[PDB]
Amino acid sequence: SGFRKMAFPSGKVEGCMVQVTCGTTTLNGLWLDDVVYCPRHVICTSEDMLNPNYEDLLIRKSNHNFLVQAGNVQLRVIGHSMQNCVLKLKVDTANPKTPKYKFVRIQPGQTFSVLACYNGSPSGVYQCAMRPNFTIKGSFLNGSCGSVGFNIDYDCVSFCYMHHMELPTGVHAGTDLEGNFYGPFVDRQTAQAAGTDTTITVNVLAWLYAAVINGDRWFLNRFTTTLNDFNLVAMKYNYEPLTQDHVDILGPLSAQTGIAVLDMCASLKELLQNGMNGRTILGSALLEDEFTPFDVVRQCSGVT
Amino acid sequence: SGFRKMAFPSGKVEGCMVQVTCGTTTLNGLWLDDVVYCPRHVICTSEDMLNPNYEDLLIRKSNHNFLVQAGNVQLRVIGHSMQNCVLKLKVDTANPKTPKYKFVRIQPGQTFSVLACYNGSPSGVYQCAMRPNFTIKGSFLNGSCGSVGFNIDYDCVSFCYMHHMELPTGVHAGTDLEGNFYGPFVDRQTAQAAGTDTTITVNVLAWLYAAVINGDRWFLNRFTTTLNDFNLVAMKYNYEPLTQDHVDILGPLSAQTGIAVLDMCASLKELLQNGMNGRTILGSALLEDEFTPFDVVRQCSGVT
Ligand SMILES: NC(=O)C1CCN(C(=O)Nc2ccccc2)CC1
Ligand SMILES: NC(=O)C1CCN(C(=O)Nc2ccccc2)CC1
């Protein structure tokens, strides 16, 4: 029992963090096989960052201008390429701690663990969501760039995020491991405003199931609703619309708890319209939307 | 920028988790040097757990009745002793992944990362507090016992918690690594009620500093207070009393932000008396008390 915002174990990812230095800029790299991945903006001074021409900046850079350090041993760079907004640094040594891994471009609403790093050294691990506007609400100081987001399926690490930018609003943007930004974001220090930060409706409902399973039930009511009816209330509250897919995904939690999905929707409708009245659910005074249905099944079943 | 409930990297601790089986009971052990540490209640059936005589139960147990497994390799048990509420299983192999480590008995209000494990396999990592009533609010299913709480200082792991019990109320109790329960708890399945769960005042104030540093300032007011005055309001709200020590510990955050500690106390007094009025602080609708002053300095400076 109990429910907690839980990160994946960071061990397999700790073993892949290196320091990448180009001139005066140091940040984090991901060492997998004989490739170190980092944000291409390692080649920018902060001045460059106002209007960088990455192609022009890169021309001036040779393999020997990329200083790659793993703990207290230096890696030889035998190759470098720009893929989208990441650099791939070919080193002469395969990372001996390379776990099984994939690159996956996640969907908005999906959750992942972030290993916050400085100078290739991990400082902490926290669980995140990709917001519907493709921002994340991270904890990232100067030198945190190249910190990666991941999920783990038994022994395989799916890398889904590399950290690049803090937006002027203090939220975070970055790329998949192919270097493609999540959302409309660019590795340029400019006015980039994120859109509306909507709540991940399916996640909130997942977390209401987690509550019920863990004994927090006060918010169960005698009402049901329809998807159309529920989505009228969702709209008003900047909740993501709920689809039959979302309903389908909640099926197992529905089944286990014996509370139909539309009944819980009607529970959630009342919570939105009437607030918590000073009560909490799983120790929270607002509706948590950074647990997926998969997350709740995982934590309430005990998958390793 | 951004502030997050961040666990220590779990890598060094992942490398020390084993499976311990005695008859039909399997749970987690901590393999450090040539000793595996586990909850002594590995020797209880759930029936025993109603009124166990650990000395009598242990007599029936030989070294060969403790099955210790590290991934898919078995460890030979050459010795076993009962220290308080833990078993120490002497194996013939030193854990080759033993990090630098200490056992430390933490103080209430202190925070630590928990690596939730099942069958010696880590499922997730989350940050915790030792509550003032010496309970923790964990996420622990059947087979999670021997899951450990820790802090990391650069490369040294201070083990501070081993998980033993879920209380009838769904909170968690367990021991330091010397086998001494935190609080009045015993490894017996009985009515054990925890005392009042007071809020960790110094932690809340630390987290208000974190808010200010991260741009959340709406709750700063024009009032100050005294320790005595503040503690009258604390009492009423089941907040731990604030001492000159607590004030001293907040000194650096005070200094950095230029907000005196007693002014922030007066900010917190108003938050207690008037609530959040539907506003949030660092994405929370209640007062967070599971960041220590050290935690806020760490995360707002970027220590690895
Ligand atoms: N800006 C540019 O035109 C270039 C593009 C290609 N390039 C490489 O280093 N390619 C390479 C070399 C050795 C092994 C593997 C790959 C440097 C940058
Ligand atoms: N219940 C009891 O009287 C005993 C107490 C001592 N004991 C041991 O196994 N001691 C031991 C043996 C070999 C190497 C290291 C330590 C078993 C339990």
Curated annotation (Swiss-Prot), chains A, B:
Residue span(s) of domain Peptidase C30: 1-304
Positions annotated as active site in the UniProt record: H41 (for 3cl-pro activity), C145 (nucleophile)
Covalent cross-link (Glycyl lysine isopeptide (Lys-Gly) (interchain with G-Cter in ubiquitin)), residues: K5, K90
Topology Cytoplasmic: residue spans: 1-304
Consequence of substituting C145A: Complete loss of 3C-like proteinase nsp5 cleavage
Subcellular localization(s) per the UniProt record: Host cytoplasm; Host Golgi apparatus; Host nucleus
Reactions catalysed according to its record: TSAVLQ-|-SGFRK-NH2 and SGVTFQ-|-GKFKK the two peptides corresponding to the two self-cleavage sites of the SARS 3C-like proteinase are the two most reactive peptide substrates. The enzyme exhibits a strong preference for substrates containing Gln at P1 position and Leu at P2 position
Record entry for activity regulation: Inhibited by pyridone-containing alpha-ketoamides compounds 13a and 13b. In turn, alpha-ketoamide 13b (tert-butyl (1-((S)-1-(((S)-4-(benzylamino)-3,4-dioxo-1-((S)-2-oxopyrrolidin-3-yl)butan-2-yl)amino)-3-cyclopropyl-1-oxopropan-2-yl)-2-oxo-1,2-dihydropyridin-3-yl)carbamate) inhibits SARS-CoV-2 replication in human lung cells. Inhibited ex vivo by michael acceptor inhibitor N3. Inhibited ex vivo by compound 11a and 11b.
Assembly, per entry: 3CL-PRO exists as monomer and homodimer. Only the homodimer shows catalytic activity. Interacts with host FBXO22; this interaction promotes the proteasomal degradation of nsp5.
Role noted for this protein: Cleaves the C-terminus of replicase polyprotein at 11 sites. Recognizes substrates containing the core sequence [ILMVF]-Q-|-[SGACN]. Cleaves and inactivates human TRMT1, preventing tRNA guanine(26)-dimethylation of tRNAs. May cleave human NLRP1 in lung epithelial cells, thereby activating the NLRP1 inflammasome pathway. May cleave human GSDMD, triggering alternative GSDME-mediated epithelial cell death upon activation of the NLRP1 inflammasome, which may enhance the release interleukins 1B, 6, 16 and 18. Also able to bind an ADP-ribose-1''-phosphate (ADRP).
Name the UniProt record assigns to this protein: 3C-like proteinase nsp5
Protein species of origin: Severe acute respiratory syndrome coronavirus 2
Gene encoding the protein: rep
Residues of the full protein shown: 3264 to 3567 of 7096
